[PDB]
Paper text:
Thousands of outer-arm dyneins (OADs) are arrayed in the axoneme to drive a rhythmic ciliary beat. Each OAD is divided into two regions, a head that contains AAA+ rings (rings) for ATP hydrolysis and a tail that holds together the whole complex. The tail is permanently attached to the MTD A-tubule, while the head region of each HC contains a microtubule-binding domain (MTBD), which binds and releases the MTD B-tubule depending on the nucleotide states. We reconstituted the purified OADs onto MTDs to mimic native arrays and determined the structures, by cryo-EM, of free OAD and OAD arrays bound to MTDs (OAD-MTD) in two different microtubule-binding states.
Cryo-EM classification reveals that the OAD arrays adopt two distinct microtubule-binding states, MTBS-1 and MTBS-2. In both states, the relative axial positions for α- and γ-MTBD are fixed on MTD (γ-MTBD is always 8 nm ahead), while the β-MTBD position is equivalent to either α-MTBD in MTBS-1 or γ-MTBD in MTBS-2. The OAD array is dramatically remodeled when β-HC moves one step ahead from MTBS-1 to MTBS-2, coupled with five major structural changes throughout the entire OAD-MTD complex. First, an 18-degree rotation between the β-stalk and β-MTBD is required for microtubule-binding state alteration, whereas β-MTBD remains in the high microtubule-affinity state42. In MTBS-1, β-HC adopts a post-1 linker docking mode, which is precisely switched to post-2 along with β-MTBD stepping forward. From MTBS-1 to MTBS-2, the α-linker docking groove on β-ring is also switched from groove-1 to groove-2. From MTBS-1 to MTBS-2, LC3BL takes over γ-Ig-PT to contact β-AAA4L. Fourth, the tail of OAD is rotated downward with respect to the head from MTBS-1 to MTBS-2. Comparing with previously reported dynein structures reveals that the ADP-bound state43 has a similar linker docking mode to post-2 of β-HC. Therefore, the β-HC in post-2 probably mimics the state after one complete nucleotide cycle.
Residue numbers in the entry:
A (entry chain E): 12 to 62
B (entry chain J): 16 to 110
C (entry chain L): 1 to 111
D (entry chain D): 61 to 209
E (entry chain R): 1 to 75
F (entry chain O): 13 to 132
G (entry chain M): 1 to 87
H (entry chain N): 4 to 117
């Protein structure tokens, strides 16, 4: 008939995730003389009508 | 348009407001009504709810509750809560 | 050496005003110093023009020695609601909003 | 975009790719339009952590622009240091001093601009409809005739 | 469970009088009609609108239960 | 409320608040486990996995036994490098909810994402 | 309908001020988002006025920022304030 | 088998999304992609659409949750741990790490019994 | 018959039309639309074009509400039997 949940559901399995190591410098120059960042102080507004 | 009942209060089944905040607001409104009736000195209970929202949520909350009314408003994402308790519908949108 | 508890604290001694950081591309020591000055400045003139508050804040950061990262002149813009994108010197931009004031404060240097 | 059939002829339901938590609709006012604009379609994508960083790889297009900015600033600094050194006799001015010296009151002007904001106010308004009263009326042929008479 | 409360007796008694008057049935419950029975017997108010006004102002109402007694307590 | 009773029959749901209750619980747990902000060594990477295991047990404790909880914890070093993580999960709309909390220290950023799916 | 914006105060050339107003009208209609409007003005100005430029659009804000002489223009449209300065 | 979660099927779905966005696979391929702030936002949304669509096409009755994280060209220490609470016989969780030239990304797929 | 109304609008500052427009718009919109939800949308749209965005108006025959509004941008009036409240926040 309709759905039921009597069967045990107690098993947990965990699989690790990793990234292979490489030289930290990696032919790259840290940062820039000028850094450009966009910051918004106004939260997005959504209009909903309820009657 | 599909109304749903949660925690003893009828509100839109798809909740515009955040699940955490919406539950707190509904509980606070029910407690306020238990103390002050909507029929007598109804203006005072609405003012108390608005001040309460500012203390635990982002400021400039707008609260409108009436037995019969129709309104359309612009609100911030997850800042609109509409629910019905008994025959009274309470709608609050955070700006 | 202190009232109630002797020798105070390394943590107890310094208190920071409540604030929200939209973005913090700056040294932590520099940001903490700016937040304390901004909170005190707003407290000194509550319900006052934002431009007046901004001018005092710009003078304070410029006046303090060893707080200059060079390049463009230090310039801070304060508005309750504003949207902008500005080119800035690397690690010279601090953005924060005071919870009590509820006004966003933007400080950065552009060359 | 698939539909799962519930056992024992239950009302059918299906799963969807769109994230439910994300706002149903996002509306942004457009000055050119001059009226509120509402977009039913939304990105509906959730990111736990978003990070933007100033990391550039060698010979990048962006890196070339950064080099031009450094060269232009250096050229102005080089011209300013050389001109001051050339104008004066045995000038000992430091490069850092020349950069500070390059900035001038006429050269750089700072103006503070703010936008007028109305003070936020809190007001409570209560509306209550006109009082209604119960009325009972009984009409009979004799009563109608009596008024008529 | 009282807690040191004198209060008037003249009125407190009146309510009990009119109450048991119509509630004499001993049904244990009270309806919206019974509340008006009293005022309808003696003729306290002109129309039910009066009693209904104050009562309604109290909070709410229904069909019948027992809390209706409030009508007299407030009457 | 026959329709409300009918709604229980199609799906029980057991929709306990999960948007911030899990987020408040994970945020409190993350601060204690993180300890010193400065530590970011290679030996600590093994320790990061231990923090994730403790987090899953706490989610079950906070009124989530009926739901199935999937939690992913990412530990990374930020030197101004920019990386954005977005998670999309297909679930019965309004029958499931997820809580995401992001904590960023001066040199270490830790993000925890918890996914709950109703099952029976 | 959107009328031409009125500048409260500016330090720009007669040829230059017309270009800023022309760019501003196109930018407002193209992007609904306030931040997007600011982003478009800075990029368009970079080709015409060089590498250093800054654009901020705030409905209500007050601030003072150092700017190169003759490169600072501030114009307010109906119900919106846009401020752009160079270096 | 026909309606049973398979680790091999999940891996191929993630592979299709990575190949579809920028992979011509090994030889006879000339692709050089550099992470950009504007491009990264588009890639996460586009990659998620392909992984969900790819999983869905051969998908059984399983609840699917996908999380995508893009590393900023390595040069930092990042470790990702995945914990799943589900019946072991009913479901399995697989995390795949992908190296794609300049940009490194990690894709995790969660399987829930239905 | 709108015996008592609350008026908080600028006078002789060239913003005098906002009060006049609200009374005129409410009478025209309420009669034609004849819907509580529709009246709020129409009044908000007309005011938004003329005086910019961030305007919220709620129309109900009987209702109780408390809200924070920008000074001199809130007007409360009764159009016939119906009561219309419009204010600007943000």
């Amino acid at each position: 008939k309709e759905f039921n949940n009597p069967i045990n559901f107690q098993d947990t399995e965990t699989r690790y995730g990793g990234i292979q190591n490489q030289v930290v410098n990696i032919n790259q120059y840290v940062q820039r003389n000028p850094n450009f960042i966009d910051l918004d102080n106004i939260a997005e507004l959504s209009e909903h009508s309820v009657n | 348009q599909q109304y749903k009942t949660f925690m003893g209060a009828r509100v839109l089944w798809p909740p515009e407001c955040a699940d955490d905040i919406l539950e707190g607001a509904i509980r606070e409104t029910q407690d306020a009504l238990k103390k002050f009736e909507i029929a007598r000195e109804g203006q005072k209970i609405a003012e108390h709810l608005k001040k309460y929202m500012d203390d635990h949520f982002d400021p400039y909350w707008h609260v409108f509750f009436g037995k019969n009314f129709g309104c359309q408003a612009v609100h911030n994402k997850n800042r609109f809560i509409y629910f019905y308790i008994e025959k009274t519908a309470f709608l609050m949108y955070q700006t | 050496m202190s009232d109630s508890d002797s020798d105070e604290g390394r943590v107890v001694e310094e208190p920071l005003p409540p604030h929200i950081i939209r973005f913090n591309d700056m040294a932590q020591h520099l940001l903490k110093k700016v937040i304390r000055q901004a909170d005190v400045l707003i407290k000194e003139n509550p319900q006052g023009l934002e431009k007046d508050i901004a001018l005092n804040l710009v003078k304070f950061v410029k006046s303090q020695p060893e707080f200059k990262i060079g390049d463009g002149e230090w310039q801070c813009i304060i508005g309750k609601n504003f949207g902008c994108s500005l080119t800035f010197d690397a690690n010279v931009l601090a953005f924060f909003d005071l919870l009590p004031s509820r006004k966003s404060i933007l400080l950065f240097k552009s060359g | 975009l698939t539909a799962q059939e519930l056992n024992e002829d239950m009302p059918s339901k299906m799963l969807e790719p769109k994230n439910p938590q994300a706002p149903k609709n996002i509306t942004v006012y457009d000055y050119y339009t001059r009226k509120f604009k509402t977009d039913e379609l939304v990105d509906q994508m959730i990111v736990h952590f978003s990070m933007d960083g100033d990391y550039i790889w060698k010979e990048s297009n962006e890196y070339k622009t950064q080099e031009e900015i450094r060269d232009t600033k250096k050229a102005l600094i080089k011209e300013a240091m050389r001109k001051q050194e050339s104008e004066e006799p045995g000038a000992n001015h430091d490069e850092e001093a020349i950069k500070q010296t390059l900035r001038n009151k006429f050269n750089y002007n700072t103006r503070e601009c703010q936008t007028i904001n109305p003070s936020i106010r809190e007001r409570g308004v209560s509306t209550e409809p006109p009082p209604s009263d119960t009325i009972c009326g009984n009409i009979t042929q004799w009563e109608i005739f009596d008024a008529y008479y | 469970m009282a807690s040191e409360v004198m209060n008037l007796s003249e009125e407190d008694i009146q309510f009990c009088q009119k109450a048991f008057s119509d509630y004499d049935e001993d049904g244990l419950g009270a309806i919206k009609v019974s509340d008006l029975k009293l005022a309808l017997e003696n003729i306290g108010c002109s129309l039910s609108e009066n009693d209904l006004f104050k009562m309604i102002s109290e909070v709410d109402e229904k069909n019948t239960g027992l809390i209706k007694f409030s009508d007299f307590l407030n009457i | 409320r026959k329709r409300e009773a009918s709604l229980i029959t199609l799906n029980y749901i057991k929709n306990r608040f999960y948007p911030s209750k899990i987020q408040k619980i994970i945020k409190e747990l993350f601060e204690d486990r993180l300890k010193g902000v400065e530590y970011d060594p290679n030996n600590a990477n093994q320790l990061s996995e231990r923090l994730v295991l403790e987090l899953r047990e706490k989610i079950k404790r906070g009124k989530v036994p009926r739901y199935k909880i999937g939690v992913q914890v990412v530990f990374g070093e930020i030197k101004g490098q920019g990386l954005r993580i977005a998670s999309k999960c297909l679930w019965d709309v309004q029958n499931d909810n997820y809580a995401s909390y992001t904590y960023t220290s001066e040199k270490v950023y830790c993000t925890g994402i918890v996914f709950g799916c109703y099952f029976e | 309908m959107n009328h031409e914006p009125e500048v409260k105060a500016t330090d720009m050339e007669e040829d230059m001020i017309k270009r800023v107003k022309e760019i501003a009208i196109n930018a407002v209609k193209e992007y609904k988002q306030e931040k997007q409007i600011a982003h478009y003005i800075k990029y368009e100005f970079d080709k015409i006025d060089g590498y250093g430029w800054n654009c901020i659009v705030g409905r209500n804000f007050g601030s003072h920022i150092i700017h190169q002489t003759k490169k600072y223009i501030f114009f307010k449209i109906n119900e919106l304030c846009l401020l752009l300065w160079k270096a | 088998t026909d309606k049973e979660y398979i680790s091999e099927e999940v891996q191929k779905a993630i592979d299709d999304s990575v190949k579809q966005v920028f992979g011509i696979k090994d030889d006879s391929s000339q692709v050089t992609i550099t992470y950009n702030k504007d491009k990264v936002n588009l890639w996460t949304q586009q990659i998620i659409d392909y992984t969900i669509r790819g999983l869905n096409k051969l998908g059984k009755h399983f609840k699917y949750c996908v999380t995508a994280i893009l590393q900023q060209t390595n040069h930092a220490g990042i470790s990702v741990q995945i914990t799943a609470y589900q019946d072991t016989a009913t479901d399995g969780s697989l995390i795949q790490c992908y190296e794609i030239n300049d940009i490194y990304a990690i894709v995790s797929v969660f399987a829930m019994a239905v | 018959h709108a015996n008592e109304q609350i008026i908080d609008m600028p006078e002789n500052s060239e913003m005098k039309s906002m009060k006049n427009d609200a009374f005129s718009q409410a009478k025209f919109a309420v009669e034609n639309y004849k819907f509580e939800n529709k009246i709020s949308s129409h009044i908000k749209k007309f005011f938004d074009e003329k005086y910019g965005p961030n305007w919220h108006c709620v129309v109900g025959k009987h209702f109780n509400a408390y809200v924070s509004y920008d000074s001199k941008n809130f007007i409360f009036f009764y159009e016939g039997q119906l009561a219309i409240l419009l204010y600007r926040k943000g």
